[PDB]
Every structure is written in structure tokens, then in C-alpha cells.
Design a protein around this ligand. Structure first.
Ligand SMILES: [Cl-]
Ligand SMILES: [Cl-]
Ligand SMILES: [Cl-]
Length: 283
């Protein structure tokens, strides 16, 4: 019943053509916090986009002795009982930092929402190994990463990776959930594949409470990644709440934007998030 209620509002926004107005209201209401660390001169080459930075209060800090900076934010959705690390696609010089973050934060799942190249432009470095016999060694952070197997499906691929801390020789299995079919322009026409992908992430065990937060990225870590986090958080809230129809997607998005700027980068992404929540509410 909460799906039919939200669907009638959705149809009202469609008929009004008010998606852009609602979206601009969100942009205007969104939190503004300092990002002084991200903007230090020494961090210039650690940011893929000069206009997308983590706030100081929620940034993930690396623990090794150097420079603690990575373009990544901890989004703690307390009522939904889930935290997420949203991060940019790693750069050629930050793939060691990325896996150091995964190790130190105890994450067991990585959700990737882009292809490495799209429309003939690079969105992310090739930060995992494509071939079993060609493992990756990150000499700066002393980590080794091996492809163990992969399950390639028509719309997404799940890879079983082994991440080894070369200092301690401890190994962990990391699952790489790679949504490979987001369209080159716009958003998916239907959220069915997106929701089936989310189900596979949530059923994998990689997001058990015993493990650290899932790491989610796209190219900047705000648009497609914001859509995934927003839909997942809203659907979780529909279980936490006594009345599932009380979940207000705009309010949830504003709460997420306390922890990372720019989440949801277009009105079409906002509409898609509503559509995904409406459909997932049925199930
Ligand atoms: Cl500096
Ligand atoms: Cl709410
Ligand atoms: Cl924005």
C-alpha cells in the first residue's frame, strides 16, 4: 500500500513536470560544511574532480604514515542502520589508497556503478585484476590483490577477489559487485535490473553487521552512487519504520547530503530513485 501511495504522488510530480523544481530545492537546502583537507595543495592529485570533495567531518582517514587523505566519505544512516563509504573512481595514483581504505575500514563488498570507459572517456582506473595470473601489488600501501573467480551475468558481474595485507600475510575475500549496464546517457528506463542487483549485494553476506561498510563508487562518487545509496536506505527504512508510507525520499536525501556533497546530480536521477523505491516497496 505504501507503493501505491508513493506512486500516486509520483504521477502528480510527472503531470506537474516538477522534478526539476524539487531537485533544485534539494540543492538549495543541502548542507554546506568545510572540505579544507581535500583542498590542500598536497591533495590536488588525489581528487578526480576539483568540484567534488569530501567534507572534513565525514572523510575517511587513511592510517599509514604519509598523508591520510582519500576522496571518500562515511555516510552514517543511523535510522536505516547502515553506513556506506561513497568514494570517487580511483585514479592511477590512488588505487593503493583505495585498497588500504577497504582493508582499514574492514569492508567486504565494493559496489561499482560505472564502466571503466564510457562514451570513449575514462571514468575510473583499472583498480582490480582482470586475469587470475596477473595479480596486482600496491607497493605504496603493501597490499596484494588477486582475482579468484568471477560470475559474469548479462547486466552485472560479481567478482571474488582476495586482498592480502603483505605486512601481516592476512587475507580477506572481497566481493566486487559491478553493475555494468547503466546507460551512457540518462537513467535506466526501468529499475528492475537495478533492484535485482541491489538484492544480490544485500544477500551476499558482504554487508553483514560484523563487517565494515560497503564501499560504493561511480566516477565522482555522488550521482549514480547517490542513487544507489538513496534507494537502498529508503527501502531499508520501509522495514525499520512502523508505517512504511512515512518514508520521505527528499528528507532522506537531505540527511545523506550532510555527509557528502552533491548526492544525486540530476533531476532524472531523483525521479529514478523514486521509481526504484516505489517498485521495491512492492517486494
Ligand atoms: Cl599542503
Ligand atoms: Cl523520512
Ligand atoms: Cl548538487
Amino acid at each position: 500500500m505504501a507503493s501505491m501511495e508513493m506512486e500516486k504522488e509520483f504521477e502528480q510530480i510527472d503531470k506537474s513536470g516538477s522534478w526539476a523544481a524539487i531537485y533544485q530545492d534539494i540543492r538549495h537546502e543541502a548542507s554546506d560544511f568545510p572540505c579544507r583537507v581535500a583542498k590542500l595543495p598536497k591533495n590536488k592529485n588525489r581528487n578526480r574532480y576539483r568540484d567534488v570533495s569530501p567534507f572534513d567531518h565525514s572523510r575517511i582517514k587513511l592510517h599509514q604514515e604519509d598523508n591520510d587523505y582519500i576522496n571518500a566519505s562515511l555516510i552514517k544512516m543511523e535510522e536505516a542502520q547502515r553506513s556506506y563509504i561513497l568514494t570517487q573512481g580511483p585514479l592511477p595514483n590512488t588505487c593503493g589508497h583505495f585498497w588500504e581504505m577497504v582493508w582499514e575500514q574492514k569492508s567486504r563488498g565494493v559496489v561499482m556503478l560505472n564502466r571503466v570507459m564510457e562514451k570513449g572517456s575514462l571514468k575510473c582506473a583499472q583498480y582490480w585484476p582482470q586475469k587470475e595470473e596477473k595479480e596486482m601489488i600496491f607497493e605504496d600501501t603493501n597490499l596484494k590483490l588477486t582475482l579468484i573467480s568471477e560470475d559474469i551475468k548479462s547486466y552485472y558481474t560479481v567478482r571474488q577477489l582476495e586482498l592480502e595485507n603483505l605486512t601481516t600475510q592476512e587475507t580477506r575475500e572481497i566481493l566486487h559487485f559491478h553493475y555494468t549496464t547503466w546507460p551512457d546517457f540518462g537513467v535506466p528506463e526501468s529499475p528492475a535490473s537495478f533492484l535485482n542487483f541491489r538484492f544480490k549485494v544485500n544477500e551476499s553476506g558482504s554487508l553483514s553487521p560484523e563487517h565494515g561498510p560497503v564501499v560504493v563508487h561511480c566516477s565522482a562518487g555522488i550521482g549514480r552512487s547517490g542513487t544507489y545509496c538513496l534507494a537502498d536506505t529508503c527501502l531499508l527504512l520501509m522495514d525499520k519504520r512502523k508505517d512504511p508510507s512515512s518514508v520521505d525520499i527528499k528528507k532522506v536525501l537531505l540527511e545523506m547530503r550532510k555527509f557528502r556533497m552533491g548526492l544525486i546530480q540530476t533531476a532524472d536521477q531523483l525521479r529514478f530513485s523514486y521509481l526504484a523505491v516505489i517498485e521495491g516497496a512492492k517486494f
